[PDB]
Design a protein around this motif. Structure first.
Motif, short mmCIF file in Angstrom:
data_model
loop_
_atom_site.label_atom_id
_atom_site.label_comp_id
_atom_site.label_asym_id
_atom_site.label_seq_id
_atom_site.Cartn_x
_atom_site.Cartn_y
_atom_site.Cartn_z
N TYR A 988 0.82 -1.21 0.00
CA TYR A 988 0.00 0.00 0.00
C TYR A 988 0.86 1.26 0.00
CZ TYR A 988 -3.20 3.61 1.79
OH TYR A 988 -3.92 4.77 1.98
N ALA A 989 1.95 1.26 0.77
CA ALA A 989 2.77 2.45 0.92
C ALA A 989 3.70 2.71 -0.26
CB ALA A 989 3.60 2.36 2.21
N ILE A 990 3.73 1.83 -1.25
CA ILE A 990 4.49 2.06 -2.47
C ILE A 990 3.59 2.54 -3.61
CG2 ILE A 990 5.60 0.80 -4.37
CD1 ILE A 990 7.49 -0.44 -2.49
N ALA A 991 2.39 1.96 -3.73
CA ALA A 991 1.45 2.39 -4.75
C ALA A 991 0.73 3.68 -4.38
CB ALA A 991 0.42 1.29 -5.01
N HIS A 992 0.69 4.04 -3.10
CA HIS A 992 0.22 5.35 -2.67
C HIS A 992 1.36 6.34 -2.51
CE1 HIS A 992 -3.64 3.53 -2.29
NE2 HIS A 992 -4.16 4.50 -1.56
N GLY A 993 2.57 5.98 -2.92
CA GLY A 993 3.69 6.89 -2.90
C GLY A 993 4.03 7.45 -1.53
N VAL A 994 3.71 6.72 -0.47
CA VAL A 994 3.98 7.21 0.87
C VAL A 994 5.49 7.21 1.12
CG1 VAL A 994 3.11 7.13 3.21
CG2 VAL A 994 1.86 5.98 1.40
N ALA A 995 5.94 8.16 1.93
CA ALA A 995 7.36 8.37 2.17
C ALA A 995 7.75 7.85 3.55
CB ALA A 995 7.72 9.86 2.06
N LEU A 996 8.99 7.37 3.64
CA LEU A 996 9.48 6.78 4.88
C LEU A 996 9.81 7.86 5.90
N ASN A 997 9.89 7.44 7.16
CA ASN A 997 10.35 8.30 8.25
C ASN A 997 11.87 8.28 8.22
OD1 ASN A 997 11.21 9.24 10.92
ND2 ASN A 997 9.03 9.17 11.46
N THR A 998 12.45 9.25 7.52
CA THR A 998 13.90 9.28 7.32
C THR A 998 14.64 9.39 8.65
OG1 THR A 998 13.90 11.68 7.03
CG2 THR A 998 13.56 10.32 5.07
N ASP A 999 14.05 10.06 9.64
CA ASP A 999 14.72 10.24 10.93
C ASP A 999 14.83 8.92 11.69
OD1 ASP A 999 13.28 10.23 13.78
OD2 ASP A 999 14.92 11.68 13.89
N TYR A 1000 13.80 8.08 11.62
CA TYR A 1000 13.77 6.87 12.44
C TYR A 1000 14.84 5.88 12.03
N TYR A 1001 15.04 5.69 10.72
CA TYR A 1001 15.97 4.67 10.25
C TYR A 1001 17.42 5.07 10.52
CZ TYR A 1001 12.08 2.32 7.85
OH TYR A 1001 10.91 1.66 7.56
N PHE A 1002 17.73 6.37 10.43
CA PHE A 1002 19.07 6.83 10.81
C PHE A 1002 19.26 6.76 12.32
CE2 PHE A 1002 22.66 9.83 11.06
CZ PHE A 1002 23.44 9.33 10.04
N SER A 1003 18.23 7.17 13.08
CA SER A 1003 18.32 7.11 14.53
C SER A 1003 18.53 5.67 15.01
CB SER A 1003 17.07 7.70 15.17
OG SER A 1003 15.93 6.89 14.93
N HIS A 1004 17.96 4.71 14.30
CA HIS A 1004 18.19 3.32 14.65
C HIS A 1004 19.59 2.90 14.24
CE1 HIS A 1004 14.64 1.49 16.53
NE2 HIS A 1004 14.01 2.52 15.99
N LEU A 1005 19.98 3.15 12.99
CA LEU A 1005 21.35 2.82 12.60
C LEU A 1005 22.35 3.29 13.66
CD1 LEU A 1005 22.60 2.94 8.96
CD2 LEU A 1005 24.17 3.24 10.88
#
Ligand SMILES: COc1cc(NC(=O)Cc2ccc(Br)cc2)ccc1C[C@H]1COC(=O)N1
Length: 1037
Positions: A988-1005
Motif C-alpha cells: 500500500y505504501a508504495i502504490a500510494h507513494g507514501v514516504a518513509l520516516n527518514t529520521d527513524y531509520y538513521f536514529s536506529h542505525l
DNA sequence: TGGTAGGGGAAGGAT
DNA sequence: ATCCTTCCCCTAC
C-alpha cells in the motif's frame, strides 16, 4: 451383491449448484458480464479437454488424467484374471478403525476375523504398495488396547475382589452412559488379568498388583479412562492400538518393508473380495499379526506418487479487486495447478491445470518446459466451479497420491477448497481419502494441521521455516534464496484483469501457478522431507502423520514406553518451572590476544547418562535411600531448595540412560558406514542419523514439560544444576592449575614453541551453559587448537565421569564480548562469527544489517581501526567524553554518512528498508495491542487485503508524519472509541507513494551502532551515544 | 503440548 | 524529564 462399506465419494451426479463468472460469456454484452452466474442446474457434470468432452465421474475407455483406481462405485475396473500374488509390500501410513461382525457378515471373511471383531473389534490397516506397483492394504485383526489400574486400590474402592467383578462394574458403568452409546455391553466383552508391575516414578516405589484390562474399541477405552473411576490412577490408557501393534509385536515398524508369512495354526492371510474393499487400493488382505514379518534386504522406496499443487482464486463481489473469501459464493476458485511425480525416481510424470474458462498457456512457458525435459501440460476446461473441484477430488481419489505437497497449503489452499466443497456445495469428504468412507479429512487452525487418511501432507512452507533462516518467506524469495532461480511474483490485485482479457491472459495465470508448483517440487526434492520424517517415524514407533503434525513428546514417550514395559514398569497417565543455566557474567570489550573455545559434547544427555538420572532412579525421601551407603550407592544433590537422591547405576539402571546409550551407539554405527556406501544409500543413512540426534536432544526437554505426558521436573532441574556445577568446576580448575606457565609447559611440552612476547595469563572470560572461552595472553595462537585438544582431554579425564566429554572447537584471533549471550569474533581460520546481535536477528531492515556488517567487518579486517580499538583500551575510556578519538576510527564516519544518502536519495529499493515481525498469537489475546505488525494487521484487515495466516511474519515500514497521517490517526481513534502508529504495508505504501520516516531509520542505525560498540567503552550506553555523535554532522542530532 | 536463559526495543505508569 | 516495569521478538545453549 454390492459394496459392504458404502462408498461416499461422488461417482454419480445429476444436478448441482452452478457458479461461474459472467466475464467468460462473450455473446453477452460487455455490460451484462460484470456479475457472476449463481444458481441450480440439472445436468451431468462434464469436463472439456482438447476439443473432446467427457463426464467428470465417467471412468474407463478414455480419460484425461491418469488413474490408479480399481473399484469405482461397485464397478470392478480390473482385467479379469487379476490375482497378483503378494509376498512383500512397503508400508507408509497406518489406519486405526473399528469393524463390527454384524456389519461384515455380508463379506466372506474367515472365521478368525469375525471372532476378532465379534461385537466390535479394532482393525489396523497397513497401507502401501507392492514392488510391482500395486496399491495394497492389509487388515490386521486382533490388536487390543489395554490399560492398568492398581488392584489394591480398585478392589477396595469398587467393593469387588475378582477380575470378573471389575468387568461387571465397567460394563455396567458404560451402560448407564449419558447417550447410551454402548447399549447391552456386558462383562464378557472385557478381559482382565492380574499382573505385577511397578510405577515408573521414584526408586522407593516397589512392585504391586494391577488389573490389566483389554479393550476392543477406542471409544470404550476413552470413555472408561475419562470418567470410569476418576479417583484411581490409570496407566497406559492413552496408548492407541497402532502403538500396541508396533510395540507388542517386536521388530515391526511404522514405515518399511513387510512380508506376509504363515501364521500360528499354519494360518495364511486371506484376500478380500472387491465388494468388501474399504480403500482405493488394487488388492486388500485380511490377516492376523503373526502373518506378518519384516523383510530386511529391502531398502529403497517403491513407486509412491507425490502430488504437488497450488491454487489461485478471484473475488466476485462489488469490489473484484479485494481479496477473495471462500465463504462468499461469489468469490470462486479460478485455477488449480497440479503436478504428479514418482517418489522412487524423483521424476515428474504428469502436469495438469484445472481452470474455470478454457485457456492456452503462453508459448514462452511451453517452450521452456518442453525444452527442460518436462512433460507436456494438459489443461482441463470447466464451465462451473463445482465441476472443476469435483474433477480435482475425483483425481485425488482415483490417482490416490500417497504424498501431497505445496506451499502454505495448510492455511490457504486446502481450507479454501474444502470450505467450498463443504459450506457451499455440500459434499462429503470422508470417502475422498484412501478409505471409501468414514475417513478423516479435517483441517485445524499450538500449530495448524491437515490430516487425511492414507494421504501424507507435507507443507513445504513449514519445512523451509524450520530449515532456512529468512526475514520473509514469500515463495519467490525462498526460491531465489535457495535455488538461485528467481521467478515471477503475483498478487490478487492483478488477477481479475488477467482473467477478463481472455484465454491467453488467463493462460498467463496458468503459467504462474505451474511455475510456483514446479518451484515447490524443486524445494521438496532438494530437502527430501519425506525421507527425513519417514526415518523419524521408523525410529520412534509412530506413524508418519503423527510424526509430522502431533509434536515431539509423543516420540520420546513411545520409546520410553517400549523400554519401561520391557523392564517391568507401567507409565501412569497424567492427562517457568525450574532454574535453568547461568551465563558467566562476562567482562566486556575487544580482545586481540588469542581466545580458546571449549564446549561439552551433548552436555545434558551426557549428564543423564553419567549420573543415572531417570524417573525410576529419583527419590524425594531419605528413608528410601537410607539403606545404602551415600556417595557410593546414590547421589545426593540439592536442587531448587530441596534434597534429591538419585540412586546410582549399579542399584537400578536408568531408563533414560539406556535410551540415550542405545541411540548413541546406533548413530555411531550407522555413521561408520557412510564412507563405504553409495551416495544413494548415504542420503538415507544421513537422514537416519539426523533423526537419532533429534530424539536424543529431545529427552531432557521431554523431561521438563510441566503438565505434559510423563513429566518429571526434578530430572530437568537436576540436569541444569549439574551442568552449572560442571562449568563452575571447569573454570576453577583451569584458573588454579594453569596460572603459572611452568605448569602449562609441565603437562604439555608444547608451550615452549608457543610462548608469546607478553606476560602469561589464562583466565575464563566467557561462558554459557556448556561453553568456556578462555583468554591466553602470553601464548601464541600457533597450535592453540591442537594443544587445547589435549587440554580438554585432560580436563575430561580428570574431572568428569564418562561419557561426559569436553572438546576444543575453535580458537579466535579477535573477539568482541558485547553483552550476555551476544558476541562477535573472528575465527583463526578467517571465518567470521556473529551471535545475538541484530545482524542475525531477521527482524531488522536489510539496509541497517548491511551497514552494521560493513562496520564490524572494518573493525575486524582493517588493521588501523583494530589498533584504534587497542588505543581505546589503553585508556579507561571514561575520560573520552572530552578527549578526541584516535585517527583510525575515521573510516566509521564515512560509512555512517553514506547511510544518510541511501536513506533520503530516491531510486533506492524500499524492500531494502522493510522490517519484519512474526505474528505469534491470535491478535485478540494480546497485552499491549499497540505493536507495529498489529497495526499493519488491522489496517490490512480493514483494506480487505491478504489477511496473514496466524503465525507468519508480517512486513512493514515506517511512515513520516503528514496531515493525512495525523488526520486518519484521529479518525481511526474516534471510530474505535507521535508513537509508532506510522506502520504501513510495503504494498500500500508504495502504490500510494507514501514516504518513509527518514529520521527513524538513521536514529536506529545509530542505535544499533551504539549497542554493538558500547563494549569498547567500558560498556556504557550514554557515553557511547555521545561520542558516536562525533561521527555525524550536528545538523542531524 | 518444545526448556531456561538473555538483551534490548516499544509503550505506559510512577517518581 | 528521568527512570523503572512489563510485554514481545527472536535469539543461544
Ligand atoms: C540447543 O540447546 C538446547 C536445546 C534444548 N531444546 C529443547 O529442550 C526443546 C525441546 C525438544 C523436545 C521436547 Br519433547 C521438549 C523441548 C534444550 C537444551 C539445550 C541446551 C544444550 C546444552 O547441552 C545440551 O545437551 N543441550
Amino acid at each position: 451383491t454390492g459394496p459392504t462399506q458404502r462408498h461416499t465419494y461422488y461417482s454419480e451426479c445429476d444436478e448441482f449448484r452452478f457458479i461461474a463468472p459472467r466475464v467468460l460469456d462473450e455473446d453477452a454484452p460487455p455490460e451484462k458480464r460484470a456479475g457472476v452466474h449463481d444458481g441450480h442446474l440439472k445436468r451431468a457434470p462434464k469436463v472439456y479437454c482438447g476439443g473432446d468432452e467427457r463426464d467428470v465421474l465417467r471412468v474407463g475407455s478414455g480419460g484425461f488424467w491418469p488413474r490408479r483406481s480399481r473399484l469405482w462405485g461397485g464397478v470392478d475396473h480390473a482385467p479379469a484374471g487379476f490375482n497378483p500374488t503378494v509376498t512383500v509390500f512397503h508400508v507408509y501410513d497406518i489406519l486405526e478403525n473399528v469393524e463390527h461382525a454384524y456389519g461384515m457378515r455380508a463379506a466372506q471373511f474367515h472365521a478368525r476375523f469375525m471372532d476378532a471383531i465379534t461385537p466390535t473389534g479394532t482393525v489396523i490397516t497397513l497401507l502401501g504398495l507392492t514392488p510391482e506397483g500395486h496399491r495394497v492394504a492389509v487388515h490386521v485383526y486382533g490388536t487390543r488396547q489395554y490399560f492398568y489400574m492398581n488392584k489394591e486400590e480398585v478392589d477396595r474402592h469398587l467393593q469387588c475382589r475378582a477380575p470378573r467383578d471389575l468387568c461387571e462394574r465397567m460394563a455396567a458403568a458404560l451402560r448407564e452412559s449419558p447417550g447410551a452409546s454402548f447399549r447391552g455391553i456386558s462383562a464378557d466383552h472385557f478381559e482382565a488379568e492380574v499382573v505385577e508391575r511397578t510405577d515408573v516414578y521414584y526408586y522407593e516405589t516397589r512392585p504391586a498388583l494391577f488389573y490389566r484390562v483389554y479393550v476392543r474399541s477406542g471409544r470404550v477405552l476413552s470413555y472408561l479412562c475419562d470418567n470410569f473411576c476418576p479417583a484411581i490412577k490409570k496407566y497406559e490408557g492413552g496408548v492407541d492400538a497402532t502403538t500396541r501393534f508396533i510395540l507388542d509385536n517386536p521388530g515391526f515398524v511404522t514405515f518399511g518393508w513387510y512380508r506376509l508369512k504363515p501364521g500360528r495354526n499354519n494360518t495364511l492371510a486371506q484376500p478380500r473380495a472387491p465388494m468388501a474393499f474399504g480403500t482405493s487400493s488394487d488388492v486388500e488382505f485380511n490377516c492376523t499379526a503373526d502373518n506378518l514379518a519384516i523383510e530386511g534386504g529391502m531398502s529403497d522406496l517403491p513407486a509412491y506418487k507425490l502430488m504437488c499443487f497450488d491454487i489461485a482464486c478471484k473475488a466476485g463481489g462489488e469490489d473484484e479487486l479485494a481479496f477473495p473469501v471462500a465463504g462468499h459464493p461469489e468469490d470462486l476458485v479460478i485455477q488449480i495447478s497440479c503436478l504428479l511425480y514418482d517418489l522412487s525416481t524423483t521424476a515428474l510424470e504428469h502436469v495438469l491445470l484445472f481452470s474455470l474458462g478454457s485457456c492456452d498457456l503462453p508459448e514462452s512457458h511451453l517452450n521452456e518446459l518442453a525444452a527442460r525435459g518436462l512433460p507436456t501440460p494438459v489443461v482441463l476446461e470447466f464451465d462451473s466451479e463445482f465441476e472443476m473441484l469435483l474433477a480435482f477430488m475425483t483425481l485425488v481419489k482415483q490417482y490416490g497420491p500417497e504424498f501431497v505437497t505445496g506451499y502454505n497449503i495448510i492455511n490457504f489452499d486446502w481450507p479454501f477448497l474444502l470450505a467450498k466443497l463443504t459450506d457451499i456445495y455440500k459434499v462429503p469428504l470422508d470417502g475422498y481419502g484412501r478409505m471409501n468412507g468414514r475417513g478423516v479429512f479435517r483441517v485445524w487452525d499450538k500449530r495448524s494441521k491437515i490430516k487425511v487418511n492414507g494421504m501424507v501432507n507435507i507443507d513445504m512452507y513449514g519445512i523451509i521455516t524450520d530449515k532456512i533462516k529468512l526475514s520473509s518467506y514469500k515463495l519467490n524469495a525462498v526460491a531465489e534464496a535457495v535455488l538461485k532461480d528467481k521467478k515471477k511474483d503475483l498478487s490478487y490485485r492483478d488477477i481479475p484483469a488477467y482473467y477478463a482479457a481472455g484465454p491467453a491472459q488467463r493462460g498467463v495465470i496458468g503459467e504462474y501457478c505451474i511455475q510456483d508448483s514446479l518451484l515447490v517440487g524443486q524445494l521438496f526434492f532438494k530437502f527430501l522431507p519425506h525421507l527425513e520424517l519417514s526415518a523419524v517415524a521408523r525410529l520412534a514407533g509412530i506413524n508418519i502423520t503423527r510424526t509430522i503434525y502431533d509434536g515431539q513428546q509423543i516420540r520420546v514417550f513411545t520409546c520410553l514406553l517400549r523400554l519401561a514395559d520391557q523392564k517391568g514398569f507401567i507409565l501412569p497417565d497424567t492427562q517457568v518451572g525450574y532454574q535453568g543455566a547461568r551465563v558467566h557474567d562476562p567482562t566486556s570489550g575487544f580482545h586481540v590476544n588469542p581466545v580458546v573455545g571449549f564446549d561439552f559434547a551433548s552436555l545434558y544427555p551426557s549428564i543423564i547418562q553419567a549420573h543415572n538420572l531417570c524417573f525410576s532412579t529419583l527419590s524425594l525421601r531419605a528413608d528410601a535411600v537410607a539403606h545404602l551407603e551415600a556417595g557410593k550407592d546414590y547421589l545426593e544433590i540439592e536442587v531448587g531448595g530441596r534434597r534429591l537422591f538419585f540412586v546410582k547405576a549399579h542399584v537400578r539402571e536408568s531408563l533414560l540412560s539406556i535410551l540415550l546409550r542405545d541411540w548413541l551407539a546406533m548413530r555411531k554405527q550407522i555413521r561408520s558406514r557412510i564412507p563405504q556406501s553409495s551416495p544413494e544409500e548415504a542420503v538415507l543413512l544421513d537422514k537416519q542419523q539426523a533423526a537419532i540426534k533429534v530424539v536424543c536432544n529431545s529427552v531432557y526437554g521431554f523431561t521438563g514439560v510441566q503438565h505434559g505426558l510423563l513429566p518429571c521436573l526434578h530430572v530437568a532441574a537436576t540436569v541444569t544444576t549439574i551442568g552449572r556445577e560442571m562449568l563452575l568446576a571447569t573454570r576453577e580448575y583451569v584458573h588454579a592449575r594453569w596460572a603459572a606457565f611452568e605448569q602449562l609447559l609441565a603437562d604439555f611440552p608444547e608451550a615452549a614453541d608457543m610462548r608469546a612476547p607478553g606476560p602469561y595469563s589464562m583466565r575464563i572470560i566467557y561462558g554459557d551453559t556448556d561453553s568456556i572461552f578462555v583468554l591466553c595472553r602470553g601464548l601464541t595462537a600457533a597450535g592453540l587448537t591442537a594443544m587445547g585438544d589435549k587440554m580438554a582431554s585432560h580436563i575430561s579425564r580428570a574431572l568428569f565421569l564418562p561419557p561426559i566429554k569436553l572438546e576444543c572447537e575453535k580458537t579466535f584471533t579477535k573477539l568482541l564480548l558485547i553483552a550476555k549471550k551476544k558476541y562477535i569474533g573472528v575465527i583463526y581460520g578467517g571465518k567470521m562469527l556473529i551471535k545475538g546481535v541484530d545482524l542475525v536477528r531477521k527482524n531488522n531492515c536489510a539496509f541497517i544489517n548491511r551497514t552494521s556488517r560493513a562496520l564490524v567487518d572494518l573493525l575486524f579486517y582493517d588493521d588501523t581501526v583494530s589498533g584504534a580499538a587497542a588505543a581505546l583500551a589503553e585508556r579507561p575510556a571514561e575520560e573520552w567524553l572530552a578527549r578526541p578519538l584516535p585517527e583510525g576510527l575515521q573510516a566509521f564516519g564515512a560509512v555512517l554518512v553514506d547511510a544518510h544518502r541511501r536513506i533520503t536519495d530516491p531510486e533506492r529499493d524500499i524492500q531494502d528498508f522493510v522490517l519484519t515481525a512474526e505474528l505469534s498469537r491470535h491478535p485478540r489475546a494480546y497485552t499491549n495491542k499497540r505493536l507495529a505488525h498489529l497495526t499493519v494487521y488491522y489496517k490490512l484487515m480493514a483494506r480487505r487485503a491478504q489477511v496473514p495466516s496466524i503465525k507468519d511474519r508480517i512486513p512493514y515500514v515506517i511512515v513520516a508524519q503528514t496531515r493525512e497521517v495525523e488526520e486518519t490517526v484521529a479518525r481511526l481513534a474516534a471510530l474505535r472509541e507521535l508513537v509508532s502508529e506510522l506502520a504501513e504495508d510495503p504494498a500500500y505504501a508504495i502504490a500510494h507513494g507514501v514516504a518513509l520516516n527518514t529520521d527513524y531509520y538513521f536514529s536506529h542505525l545509530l542505535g544499533a551502532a551504539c549497542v554493538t560498540f558500547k563494549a569498547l567503552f567500558g560498556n556504557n550506553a550514554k557515553i557511547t551515544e555521545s561520542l558516536l555523535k562525533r561521527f555525524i554532522p550536528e545538523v542531524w542530532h
